[PDB]
Coordinates of C-alpha atoms and ligand atoms in Angstrom, one line a residue:
Chain R
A1 CA -22.0 55.5 -61.9
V2 CA -21.7 51.6 -61.9
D3 CA -21.6 49.3 -59.0
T4 CA -21.3 45.5 -58.8
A5 CA -21.2 42.9 -56.1
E6 CA -17.8 42.6 -54.5
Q7 CA -16.7 39.8 -52.2
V8 CA -13.5 39.8 -50.1
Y9 CA -11.4 36.7 -50.3
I10 CA -9.6 35.8 -47.1
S11 CA -7.0 33.0 -46.8
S12 CA -5.3 31.5 -43.8
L13 CA -2.2 33.7 -44.2
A14 CA -3.9 36.9 -43.5
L15 CA -6.1 35.3 -40.8
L16 CA -3.1 33.9 -38.8
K17 CA -1.2 37.2 -39.3
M18 CA -4.3 39.0 -37.8
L19 CA -4.2 36.5 -35.0
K20 CA -0.6 37.5 -34.4
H21 CA -1.8 41.0 -34.8
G22 CA -4.4 40.0 -32.3
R23 CA -1.6 39.2 -29.8
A24 CA -0.3 42.5 -31.0
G25 CA -3.8 43.9 -30.3
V26 CA -2.7 45.6 -27.0
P27 CA -4.6 49.0 -26.3
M28 CA -1.7 50.8 -27.8
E29 CA -2.8 51.8 -31.3
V30 CA -1.2 49.7 -34.1
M31 CA -0.9 49.8 -37.9
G32 CA -1.1 47.2 -40.5
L33 CA -0.9 46.6 -44.3
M34 CA -2.5 44.2 -46.7
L35 CA -1.2 43.2 -50.2
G36 CA -2.5 41.3 -53.2
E37 CA -3.4 41.4 -56.9
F38 CA -6.6 42.5 -58.6
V39 CA -7.8 40.3 -61.5
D40 CA -11.0 42.3 -61.9
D41 CA -13.4 44.8 -60.4
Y42 CA -15.8 42.6 -58.4
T43 CA -13.3 40.3 -56.8
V44 CA -10.4 41.1 -54.4
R45 CA -7.7 38.8 -53.0
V46 CA -5.3 39.3 -50.2
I47 CA -2.1 37.4 -49.7
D48 CA 0.9 39.3 -48.2
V49 CA 0.0 40.7 -44.8
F50 CA 2.5 42.1 -42.1
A51 CA 2.6 44.3 -39.1
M52 CA 4.0 47.8 -38.2
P53 CA 6.0 49.2 -35.3
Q54 CA 4.1 50.9 -32.6
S55 CA 4.1 54.6 -31.9
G56 CA 3.0 57.1 -29.3
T57 CA 1.1 59.3 -31.8
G58 CA -1.2 56.2 -32.5
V59 CA -3.0 55.6 -35.7
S60 CA -2.7 58.5 -38.1
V61 CA -1.8 59.3 -41.7
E62 CA 1.4 61.0 -40.5
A63 CA 2.3 57.8 -38.6
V64 CA 2.9 56.0 -41.9
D65 CA 6.4 56.5 -43.3
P66 CA 6.2 56.7 -47.2
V67 CA 9.9 56.1 -47.7
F68 CA 10.0 53.2 -45.4
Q69 CA 6.7 51.8 -46.9
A70 CA 8.1 52.1 -50.5
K71 CA 11.3 50.6 -49.2
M72 CA 9.7 47.5 -47.7
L73 CA 7.5 47.2 -50.8
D74 CA 10.6 47.3 -53.0
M75 CA 12.1 44.5 -50.8
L76 CA 9.1 42.6 -51.5
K77 CA 9.4 43.3 -55.2
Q78 CA 13.0 42.0 -55.4
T79 CA 11.6 38.8 -53.6
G80 CA 8.9 36.4 -54.7
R81 CA 6.0 38.8 -53.6
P82 CA 5.0 40.8 -56.5
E83 CA 1.8 42.2 -55.1
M84 CA 0.6 45.9 -54.7
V85 CA -1.0 47.0 -51.5
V86 CA -4.8 46.4 -51.5
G87 CA -5.4 48.4 -48.4
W88 CA -4.5 48.6 -44.7
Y89 CA -5.9 47.1 -41.4
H90 CA -5.8 48.0 -37.7
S91 CA -7.2 47.3 -34.2
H92 CA -9.8 49.2 -32.1
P93 CA -9.7 47.5 -28.6
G94 CA -12.5 48.1 -26.1
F95 CA -14.3 51.1 -27.5
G96 CA -15.8 49.1 -30.3
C97 CA -14.9 48.0 -33.8
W98 CA -16.2 51.2 -35.4
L99 CA -14.3 54.0 -37.0
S100 CA -13.6 57.4 -35.6
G101 CA -12.9 60.7 -37.3
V102 CA -9.1 60.4 -37.7
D103 CA -9.6 56.8 -38.9
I104 CA -12.1 57.7 -41.5
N105 CA -10.0 60.7 -42.5
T106 CA -6.8 58.6 -43.0
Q107 CA -9.0 56.2 -44.8
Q108 CA -10.3 58.9 -47.1
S109 CA -6.6 59.8 -47.6
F110 CA -5.5 56.2 -48.3
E111 CA -8.4 55.5 -50.6
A112 CA -7.2 58.2 -53.1
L113 CA -5.2 55.6 -54.9
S114 CA -7.2 52.4 -54.7
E115 CA -11.0 52.7 -55.2
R116 CA -11.6 49.6 -53.2
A117 CA -9.4 50.0 -50.1
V118 CA -10.4 47.1 -48.0
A119 CA -10.8 48.0 -44.3
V120 CA -10.4 45.3 -41.7
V121 CA -10.6 45.8 -38.0
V122 CA -9.7 43.0 -35.5
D123 CA -10.6 43.1 -31.8
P124 CA -9.9 39.8 -30.1
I125 CA -10.0 41.5 -26.6
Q126 CA -13.8 41.3 -26.1
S127 CA -14.2 38.7 -28.8
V128 CA -15.0 35.2 -27.3
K129 CA -12.6 32.3 -28.4
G130 CA -15.8 30.5 -29.5
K131 CA -15.9 32.5 -32.8
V132 CA -13.1 34.1 -34.7
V133 CA -15.5 35.5 -37.3
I134 CA -14.6 38.9 -38.3
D135 CA -16.5 41.6 -40.4
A136 CA -14.7 43.5 -43.2
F137 CA -15.6 47.2 -43.7
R138 CA -16.2 49.5 -46.6
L139 CA -16.6 53.2 -47.3
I140 CA -19.7 54.7 -49.2
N141 CA -19.5 57.9 -51.2
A142 CA -20.9 61.2 -49.9
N143 CA -22.5 62.0 -53.2
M144 CA -24.7 58.9 -53.2
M145 CA -26.9 60.3 -50.4
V146 CA -29.4 61.6 -53.0
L147 CA -29.9 58.2 -54.7
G148 CA -30.1 54.7 -53.1
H149 CA -27.6 53.7 -50.4
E150 CA -26.2 50.4 -51.6
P151 CA -26.7 49.5 -55.3
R152 CA -25.3 46.0 -54.9
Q153 CA -26.8 42.8 -56.4
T154 CA -26.7 39.3 -54.9
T155 CA -28.8 40.1 -51.9
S156 CA -28.7 36.4 -50.8
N157 CA -25.4 37.0 -49.0
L158 CA -26.9 39.7 -46.6
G159 CA -28.2 36.9 -44.3
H160 CA -24.5 35.8 -44.1
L161 CA -23.7 39.4 -43.4
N162 CA -26.3 39.4 -40.8
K163 CA -23.7 37.9 -38.3
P164 CA -23.3 41.2 -36.7
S165 CA -26.9 41.1 -35.2
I166 CA -26.1 43.7 -32.5
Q167 CA -29.1 46.0 -32.3
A168 CA -27.1 49.1 -31.5
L169 CA -24.0 49.6 -33.7
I170 CA -25.6 48.4 -37.0
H171 CA -28.6 50.6 -37.6
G172 CA -27.2 53.1 -35.2
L173 CA -24.1 53.8 -37.3
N174 CA -25.9 52.7 -40.6
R175 CA -25.8 56.3 -41.8
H176 CA -23.2 56.7 -44.5
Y177 CA -21.8 53.4 -43.5
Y178 CA -22.0 49.7 -44.5
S179 CA -20.1 46.4 -44.7
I180 CA -19.1 43.7 -47.1
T181 CA -19.4 39.8 -47.0
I182 CA -16.5 37.5 -46.2
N183 CA -15.5 34.1 -47.7
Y184 CA -12.5 31.9 -47.6
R185 CA -10.5 29.6 -49.9
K186 CA -8.9 26.2 -49.5
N187 CA -7.1 23.8 -51.7
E188 CA -6.1 20.1 -51.3
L189 CA -2.5 20.9 -50.2
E190 CA -3.4 23.2 -47.3
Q191 CA -6.3 20.9 -46.4
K192 CA -4.2 17.7 -46.2
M193 CA -1.2 19.5 -44.6
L194 CA -3.1 21.3 -41.9
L195 CA -5.3 18.3 -41.2
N196 CA -2.4 16.0 -40.9
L197 CA -0.5 18.6 -38.7
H198 CA -3.5 19.1 -36.4
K199 CA -4.2 15.3 -36.2
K200 CA -0.5 14.9 -35.3
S201 CA -0.8 17.8 -32.7
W202 CA -3.5 15.8 -31.1
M203 CA -1.4 12.6 -31.4
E204 CA 2.0 11.5 -30.3
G205 CA 5.3 11.2 -32.2
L206 CA 5.4 7.4 -32.5
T207 CA 1.8 7.3 -31.4
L208 CA 2.5 4.2 -29.4
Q209 CA 4.0 6.1 -26.5
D210 CA 1.3 7.7 -24.2
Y211 CA -1.3 4.9 -25.0
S212 CA 0.2 2.1 -23.0
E213 CA 0.9 4.7 -20.3
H214 CA -2.8 5.2 -19.6
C215 CA -3.3 1.5 -20.3
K216 CA -1.0 0.7 -17.3
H217 CA -2.5 3.8 -15.5
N218 CA -5.9 2.1 -15.5
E219 CA -5.0 0.1 -12.5
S220 CA -3.7 3.2 -10.6
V221 CA -5.3 6.5 -11.8
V222 CA -8.5 5.5 -13.4
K223 CA -9.4 3.2 -10.5
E224 CA -9.7 6.2 -8.0
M225 CA -11.8 8.1 -10.7
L226 CA -14.0 5.0 -10.9
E227 CA -14.4 5.1 -7.1
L228 CA -15.4 8.7 -7.2
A229 CA -17.7 7.9 -10.1
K230 CA -19.4 5.2 -8.0
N231 CA -19.7 7.7 -5.1
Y232 CA -21.6 10.3 -7.3
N233 CA -23.6 7.5 -8.9
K234 CA -24.6 6.3 -5.4
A235 CA -25.3 10.0 -4.5
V236 CA -27.8 9.8 -7.3
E237 CA -29.1 6.4 -6.3
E238 CA -30.1 7.6 -2.9
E239 CA -32.4 10.0 -4.6
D240 CA -33.4 7.3 -7.0
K241 CA -34.7 5.4 -3.9
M242 CA -37.0 8.4 -3.3
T243 CA -38.1 8.6 -6.9
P244 CA -40.5 5.6 -7.1
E245 CA -42.6 7.3 -4.3
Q246 CA -43.0 10.3 -6.6
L247 CA -43.7 7.9 -9.4
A248 CA -46.3 6.4 -7.2
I249 CA -47.9 9.8 -6.4
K250 CA -47.8 12.3 -9.2
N251 CA -46.5 11.2 -12.5
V252 CA -47.8 14.3 -14.0
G253 CA -45.1 16.8 -15.2
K254 CA -41.5 17.0 -14.4
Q255 CA -40.4 19.3 -11.6
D256 CA -36.8 18.0 -11.6
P257 CA -34.5 19.6 -14.4
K258 CA -31.9 16.9 -13.6
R259 CA -31.9 14.3 -16.4
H260 CA -30.1 11.6 -14.3
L261 CA -29.6 9.6 -17.5
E262 CA -27.2 11.1 -20.0
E263 CA -24.6 11.8 -17.2
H264 CA -24.5 8.2 -16.1
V265 CA -24.3 7.3 -19.8
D266 CA -21.2 9.5 -20.0
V267 CA -20.0 7.7 -16.9
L268 CA -20.3 4.4 -18.8
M269 CA -18.5 6.1 -21.8
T270 CA -15.5 6.8 -19.4
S271 CA -16.0 3.2 -18.1
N272 CA -15.6 1.8 -21.7
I273 CA -11.9 3.0 -21.7
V274 CA -10.9 -0.1 -19.8
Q275 CA -12.6 -2.3 -22.3
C276 CA -11.1 -0.4 -25.3
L277 CA -7.5 -0.5 -23.9
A278 CA -8.0 -4.2 -22.9
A279 CA -7.5 -5.2 -26.6
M280 CA -4.6 -2.8 -26.7
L281 CA -2.9 -4.5 -23.8
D282 CA -3.7 -7.8 -25.5
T283 CA -1.9 -6.6 -28.8
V284 CA 1.0 -5.4 -26.7
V285 CA 1.3 -8.7 -24.8
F286 CA 0.9 -10.8 -27.9
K287 CA 3.3 -9.1 -30.3
Chain D
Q749 CA -44.1 15.8 -67.2
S750 CA -46.2 15.5 -70.4
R751 CA -49.6 13.7 -71.1
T752 CA -47.8 10.6 -72.5
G753 CA -45.8 10.3 -69.3
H754 CA -42.5 11.6 -70.5
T755 CA -40.8 14.6 -68.7
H756 CA -40.2 17.8 -70.5
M757 CA -36.6 18.8 -70.8
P758 CA -37.1 22.7 -71.0
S759 CA -39.4 22.4 -68.1
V760 CA -36.8 20.7 -65.9
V761 CA -34.1 23.1 -67.1
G762 CA -36.4 26.0 -66.5
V763 CA -37.3 25.1 -63.0
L764 CA -33.8 24.1 -62.0
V765 CA -32.4 27.4 -63.3
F766 CA -35.3 29.0 -61.5
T767 CA -33.9 27.4 -58.4
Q768 CA -30.4 28.7 -59.4
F769 CA -31.7 32.2 -58.9
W770 CA -29.9 32.1 -55.5
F771 CA -26.5 32.8 -57.1
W772 CA -27.7 34.9 -60.0
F773 CA -31.2 36.6 -59.9
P774 CA -31.4 37.7 -63.6
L775 CA -31.3 33.9 -64.5
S776 CA -34.9 33.6 -63.3
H777 CA -36.1 34.7 -66.7
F778 CA -35.8 31.1 -67.9
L779 CA -38.9 30.3 -66.0
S780 CA -41.0 31.4 -68.9
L781 CA -39.7 28.5 -71.2
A782 CA -40.9 26.1 -68.5
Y783 CA -44.4 27.3 -68.9
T784 CA -46.8 24.6 -70.2
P785 CA -50.3 25.8 -71.3
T786 CA -53.1 23.4 -70.3
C787 CA -55.8 23.0 -73.0
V788 CA -57.2 21.0 -75.8
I789 CA -57.3 21.2 -79.6
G790 CA -60.4 21.1 -81.8
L791 CA -58.7 22.3 -84.8
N792 CA -59.3 20.2 -88.0
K793 CA -57.7 22.1 -90.9
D794 CA -55.0 24.7 -90.8
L795 CA -57.0 27.6 -92.4
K796 CA -60.3 26.4 -91.1
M797 CA -61.3 27.0 -87.5
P798 CA -64.4 25.2 -86.2
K799 CA -66.2 25.3 -82.9
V800 CA -66.4 22.5 -80.4
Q801 CA -68.6 22.8 -77.3
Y802 CA -68.8 19.9 -74.9
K803 CA -70.5 19.4 -71.4
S804 CA -69.3 18.7 -68.0
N805 CA -70.7 16.6 -65.1
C806 CA -69.6 19.1 -62.5
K807 CA -70.5 22.6 -61.3
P808 CA -69.1 25.6 -63.5
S809 CA -69.2 27.9 -60.6
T810 CA -66.7 25.8 -58.8
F811 CA -64.3 25.9 -61.8
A812 CA -64.8 29.6 -62.3
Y813 CA -62.3 32.3 -61.6
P814 CA -61.6 33.5 -58.0
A815 CA -62.3 37.3 -58.8
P816 CA -60.4 39.5 -56.1
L817 CA -61.7 42.6 -54.5
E818 CA -62.5 45.6 -56.7
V819 CA -60.4 48.4 -55.0
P820 CA -61.0 51.2 -57.5
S834 CA -75.6 21.2 -59.8
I835 CA -74.6 20.5 -63.5
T836 CA -73.6 22.7 -66.4
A837 CA -75.5 22.4 -69.7
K838 CA -72.3 23.1 -71.7
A839 CA -68.6 24.0 -71.2
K840 CA -67.5 27.7 -71.3
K841 CA -64.9 26.7 -73.9
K842 CA -65.8 27.9 -77.4
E843 CA -64.2 28.8 -80.8
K844 CA -61.8 25.8 -81.2
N880 CA -60.4 29.8 -76.8
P881 CA -60.0 27.0 -74.3
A882 CA -59.4 28.2 -70.6
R883 CA -57.4 26.6 -67.8
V884 CA -58.2 23.0 -67.1
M885 CA -57.2 20.8 -64.3
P886 CA -55.9 17.2 -65.1
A887 CA -58.5 15.8 -62.7
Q888 CA -61.3 17.4 -64.7
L889 CA -60.4 15.4 -67.7
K890 CA -62.3 12.3 -66.4
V891 CA -65.5 14.1 -65.7
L892 CA -66.0 15.5 -69.3
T893 CA -68.7 14.0 -71.6
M894 CA -69.0 14.6 -75.4
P895 CA -72.4 15.7 -76.6
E896 CA -74.3 13.0 -78.5
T897 CA -76.2 15.8 -80.5
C898 CA -72.9 17.4 -81.6
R899 CA -72.4 17.7 -85.3
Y900 CA -68.6 17.4 -85.5
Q901 CA -66.9 14.4 -83.8
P902 CA -63.4 13.2 -84.1
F903 CA -62.6 9.6 -85.4
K904 CA -60.9 8.8 -82.1
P905 CA -63.0 8.7 -78.9
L906 CA -61.9 11.4 -76.4
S907 CA -61.1 10.3 -73.0
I908 CA -58.2 12.1 -71.6
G909 CA -57.0 15.6 -72.5
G910 CA -54.5 15.9 -75.3
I911 CA -53.7 16.8 -78.9
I912 CA -56.2 15.5 -81.3
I913 CA -58.0 16.7 -84.7
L914 CA -61.6 17.0 -85.8
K915 CA -63.3 14.9 -88.4
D916 CA -66.3 16.1 -90.4
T917 CA -69.2 13.6 -90.1
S918 CA -71.5 15.3 -92.5
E919 CA -68.9 16.4 -95.0
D920 CA -71.0 19.3 -96.2
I921 CA -71.2 23.1 -96.4
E922 CA -71.6 25.6 -93.5
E923 CA -68.4 24.8 -91.7
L924 CA -68.9 28.0 -89.5
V925 CA -65.7 29.7 -90.4
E926 CA -64.6 32.8 -88.3
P927 CA -62.4 35.8 -89.4
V928 CA -59.0 36.8 -88.1
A929 CA -57.8 39.5 -85.9
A930 CA -56.0 42.7 -86.9
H931 CA -52.9 44.8 -86.2
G932 CA -51.9 45.5 -82.6
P933 CA -49.4 44.6 -79.9
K934 CA -49.0 41.1 -81.4
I935 CA -48.2 40.1 -85.0
Chain E
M1 CA 23.6 55.8 -68.1
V2 CA 25.0 52.2 -68.1
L3 CA 23.1 49.5 -66.2
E4 CA 25.4 46.7 -65.0
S5 CA 26.4 44.7 -62.0
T6 CA 29.9 44.6 -60.6
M7 CA 31.4 41.5 -58.8
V8 CA 34.9 41.7 -57.4
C9 CA 36.9 38.8 -56.0
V10 CA 39.9 39.5 -53.7
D11 CA 42.7 37.1 -52.8
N12 CA 43.0 36.4 -49.1
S13 CA 46.0 34.3 -49.4
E14 CA 49.5 35.1 -48.0
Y15 CA 51.0 35.3 -51.5
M16 CA 50.0 39.0 -51.7
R17 CA 52.2 39.9 -48.7
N18 CA 55.4 38.7 -50.3
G19 CA 58.5 40.9 -50.0
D20 CA 59.5 40.9 -53.7
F21 CA 56.5 42.6 -55.1
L22 CA 54.4 45.3 -53.4
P23 CA 54.2 45.4 -49.7
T24 CA 50.9 43.6 -49.1
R25 CA 49.3 44.9 -52.4
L26 CA 45.9 43.8 -51.0
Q27 CA 45.5 47.4 -49.8
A28 CA 46.6 48.7 -53.3
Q29 CA 44.0 46.7 -55.1
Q30 CA 41.6 47.7 -52.3
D31 CA 42.2 51.3 -53.3
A32 CA 41.7 50.2 -56.9
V33 CA 38.3 48.8 -55.9
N34 CA 37.7 52.1 -54.1
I35 CA 38.5 54.4 -57.1
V36 CA 36.7 52.2 -59.6
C37 CA 33.5 51.9 -57.5
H38 CA 33.8 55.7 -56.9
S39 CA 34.2 56.1 -60.6
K40 CA 31.0 53.9 -61.2
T41 CA 29.4 56.0 -58.5
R42 CA 30.1 59.2 -60.5
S43 CA 28.9 57.5 -63.7
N44 CA 26.0 55.4 -62.5
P45 CA 25.4 55.5 -58.7
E46 CA 22.6 52.9 -59.0
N47 CA 25.0 50.1 -59.6
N48 CA 25.6 47.6 -57.0
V49 CA 28.8 45.9 -56.0
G50 CA 29.2 42.4 -54.3
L51 CA 32.2 41.1 -52.4
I52 CA 33.5 37.6 -51.9
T53 CA 36.8 35.7 -51.8
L54 CA 38.4 32.8 -53.8
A55 CA 38.9 30.6 -50.9
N56 CA 37.6 27.1 -50.2
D57 CA 34.5 28.3 -48.1
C58 CA 32.7 30.9 -50.0
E59 CA 31.4 33.7 -47.6
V60 CA 29.8 36.9 -48.8
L61 CA 31.0 39.9 -46.7
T62 CA 28.6 42.3 -48.3
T63 CA 25.6 41.8 -50.5
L64 CA 25.3 43.8 -53.7
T65 CA 24.3 47.4 -52.8
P66 CA 24.5 50.9 -54.3
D67 CA 25.9 52.3 -51.1
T68 CA 29.6 51.5 -50.6
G69 CA 29.6 53.2 -47.2
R70 CA 29.5 50.0 -45.2
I71 CA 31.4 48.2 -47.9
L72 CA 34.5 50.2 -47.1
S73 CA 34.2 49.1 -43.5
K74 CA 33.7 45.5 -44.7
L75 CA 36.8 45.7 -46.7
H76 CA 38.8 44.8 -43.6
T77 CA 39.3 41.4 -41.8
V78 CA 40.2 39.5 -45.0
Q79 CA 40.7 36.4 -42.8
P80 CA 44.0 35.1 -44.3
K81 CA 43.3 31.4 -44.6
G82 CA 43.0 28.8 -47.3
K83 CA 44.9 28.9 -50.6
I84 CA 42.8 29.1 -53.8
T85 CA 39.5 27.8 -55.4
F86 CA 38.2 28.2 -58.9
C87 CA 35.1 26.2 -59.9
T88 CA 32.9 26.9 -56.8
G89 CA 34.3 30.5 -56.8
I90 CA 32.7 30.9 -60.3
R91 CA 29.5 29.0 -59.3
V92 CA 29.0 31.2 -56.2
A93 CA 29.0 34.3 -58.4
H94 CA 27.7 33.6 -61.9
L95 CA 24.9 31.6 -60.5
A96 CA 24.3 34.2 -57.9
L97 CA 23.9 36.8 -60.6
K98 CA 20.1 36.1 -60.5
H99 CA 19.8 37.5 -57.0
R100 CA 20.4 41.1 -58.3
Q101 CA 17.7 43.7 -57.9
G102 CA 17.5 45.4 -61.2
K103 CA 16.8 42.9 -64.1
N104 CA 17.9 45.4 -66.7
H105 CA 21.5 45.5 -65.4
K106 CA 24.1 43.7 -67.5
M107 CA 26.2 40.8 -66.0
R108 CA 29.9 41.7 -65.2
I109 CA 32.2 39.8 -63.0
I110 CA 36.0 40.2 -62.5
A111 CA 38.6 38.4 -60.4
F112 CA 42.0 38.9 -58.8
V113 CA 44.1 35.8 -59.0
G114 CA 47.3 35.8 -56.9
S115 CA 47.7 32.0 -56.9
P116 CA 48.5 29.2 -59.4
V117 CA 45.4 27.3 -60.7
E118 CA 45.1 23.8 -59.3
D119 CA 42.4 22.8 -61.8
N120 CA 43.3 21.1 -65.1
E121 CA 42.6 22.2 -68.6
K122 CA 39.4 20.2 -68.7
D123 CA 37.6 22.1 -65.8
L124 CA 38.9 25.3 -67.4
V125 CA 37.5 24.7 -70.9
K126 CA 34.3 23.3 -69.4
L127 CA 33.6 26.3 -67.1
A128 CA 34.6 28.6 -70.0
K129 CA 32.0 26.8 -72.1
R130 CA 29.4 27.3 -69.4
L131 CA 30.2 31.1 -69.1
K132 CA 30.1 31.3 -72.9
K133 CA 26.8 29.4 -72.9
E134 CA 25.1 31.8 -70.4
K135 CA 27.0 34.7 -71.9
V136 CA 28.4 36.5 -69.0
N137 CA 31.2 39.2 -69.2
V138 CA 34.5 38.0 -67.5
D139 CA 37.6 40.0 -67.0
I140 CA 40.7 38.0 -66.0
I141 CA 43.2 39.9 -63.8
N142 CA 46.3 38.2 -62.4
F143 CA 48.5 39.9 -59.7
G144 CA 51.8 38.2 -59.2
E145 CA 53.0 34.9 -60.8
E146 CA 55.3 31.9 -60.2
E147 CA 55.3 29.8 -63.4
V148 CA 54.9 31.2 -66.9
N149 CA 52.3 33.9 -67.3
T150 CA 50.1 32.7 -70.1
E151 CA 50.3 29.2 -71.4
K152 CA 46.9 27.5 -71.4
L153 CA 45.3 30.8 -70.0
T154 CA 45.5 32.2 -73.6
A155 CA 43.4 29.5 -75.0
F156 CA 41.3 29.7 -71.9
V157 CA 40.5 33.3 -72.6
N158 CA 40.0 32.7 -76.3
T159 CA 37.5 30.0 -75.7
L160 CA 35.8 31.9 -72.9
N161 CA 35.5 35.1 -74.9
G162 CA 32.7 35.2 -77.5
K163 CA 31.4 38.2 -79.5
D164 CA 34.7 39.5 -80.8
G165 CA 33.3 42.9 -81.4
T166 CA 33.4 45.2 -78.3
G167 CA 33.8 42.1 -76.1
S168 CA 35.9 41.4 -73.0
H169 CA 39.5 42.3 -72.7
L170 CA 42.5 40.5 -71.1
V171 CA 44.6 42.2 -68.4
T172 CA 48.2 41.2 -68.1
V173 CA 50.4 43.0 -65.6
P174 CA 54.2 42.3 -65.5
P175 CA 56.5 42.9 -62.5
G176 CA 57.3 46.6 -61.8
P177 CA 57.7 49.5 -59.4
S178 CA 54.4 51.1 -60.6
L179 CA 51.2 50.4 -59.0
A180 CA 48.3 48.3 -60.2
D181 CA 45.8 51.2 -60.3
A182 CA 46.8 53.1 -63.5
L183 CA 47.7 49.7 -65.0
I184 CA 44.3 48.3 -64.7
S185 CA 42.8 51.6 -65.6
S186 CA 44.4 51.3 -69.0
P187 CA 41.6 49.1 -70.6
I188 CA 38.0 50.4 -71.3
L189 CA 36.7 48.2 -68.5
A190 CA 37.9 50.8 -65.9
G191 CA 36.3 54.2 -66.1
Ligands
ZN1001 ZN1 -9.0 54.2 -29.1

């Protein structure tokens, strides 16, 4: 009867694989597996993550083929992936990220081996692209109903676990159910590689290609945009002619939500492109 | 920091570890080592305990204890005796004044609160010695 | 039972189709591979058998597998091109022995040579020194001949073969009407 504080380690591997699984997150019920190695009790790491072929039966304990499972696992053993399965993941599109009866039953059946059995549910469908943040799931014992619910230390991370702030599902399904915190890990190799690759993704091959293009497009394309900018600015100025009257009348309080400033500032920011590319053209002409 | 102006190492350690309670809560037990008692010392000899009573220029009622709910202009002398010195504010060290009629006085004039000894001016009998406690929760 | 890996090399040249000796003995030694792999199947079915040729470009027809079912189908289309190659033919097998599944299986590689060796004694004794260094069992089998049977090949085998006790054996088959099956089944390496 001992319980410690566990934290699920998530890398970019499983994340991206769950993004591809997000593209695979069609309403048809799907299956997934997670692999890794357990160094100790209170830490869990996942590395190898793959998908599973779809079926008409949907998610079930019968849907998982044991011989095919062990086969693929053996194929992973002969290769450079010597990690045991740490659990299984799936998708629950549109009816919520919670777990049904069959799901918690096959979870109960799959947790017979591993005491941990990390449960991850991804649902990109109603999830905005603003945040990819996901919440891992856990299974409480049925014999702990007499004593306290969660005997876990390090309560400082519950505020980080407060991200699902929804006022329904949380304390609604809180009975015999709970969750676990999620953190990531990054080294220098992944950092430098991904940063350089992304910067290059926002850049060009020789990087000198599409610059001079816009530099020479300043006299064609941008000019029209500058004319339109002058049109909108004048459309503001005609009201700005009406403004000093109000400034000569009330001056108390602001009934106009329009700032009229920062937008024109941004217009100037778009106007600075000519100045910034001027030196560029100078460098091109010079040498 | 200390009275001499130097900072206490176990105090800084204690309070920083106290701020380290975020990661590990049981580590907050090191706060007890950062506790610094505020008082004076009227002790002259190791086996001899005298009694020194001074006076203050402020109100004793203002320096008293804020007794909570039950739920079942100048003081003649300080409340500190048998030296059991109570809590003392560093700002109250400037307002204390030694009695001119006091029998026992140190060789060094007392100005700011700190660690000092007591010197016998009379060098005679009747040192007013008090007994020692008995067995219990402590040693 | 016995845990070991089996690597068989077949000669894809046109010297096997000659009219003096057996009428395209490739099929005969194919049947030999069949009966010895079925023998190994009867003894220890968990053993895997790989297949590759001695030609210039090394191309694996079938990866090592306990099931010879598809192997029997892959025994066809020998692609009769090239002549012979030795060094990279060794390096494509002995160095590829690390790709096996079971790590408890012993390393055993044989060869069928129907063509004269183009490599000098230097490469021979060097590669033999390498195989002796990494300690891999090698069985030399030569079907058909032009020049003298064993000249430098004797010293080659002697230098290649270490651990005299229960070590490797040399198989030398002369011309004759009899098949190669019962002839290569004579040593202890077969069955
Ligand atoms: Zn559903």
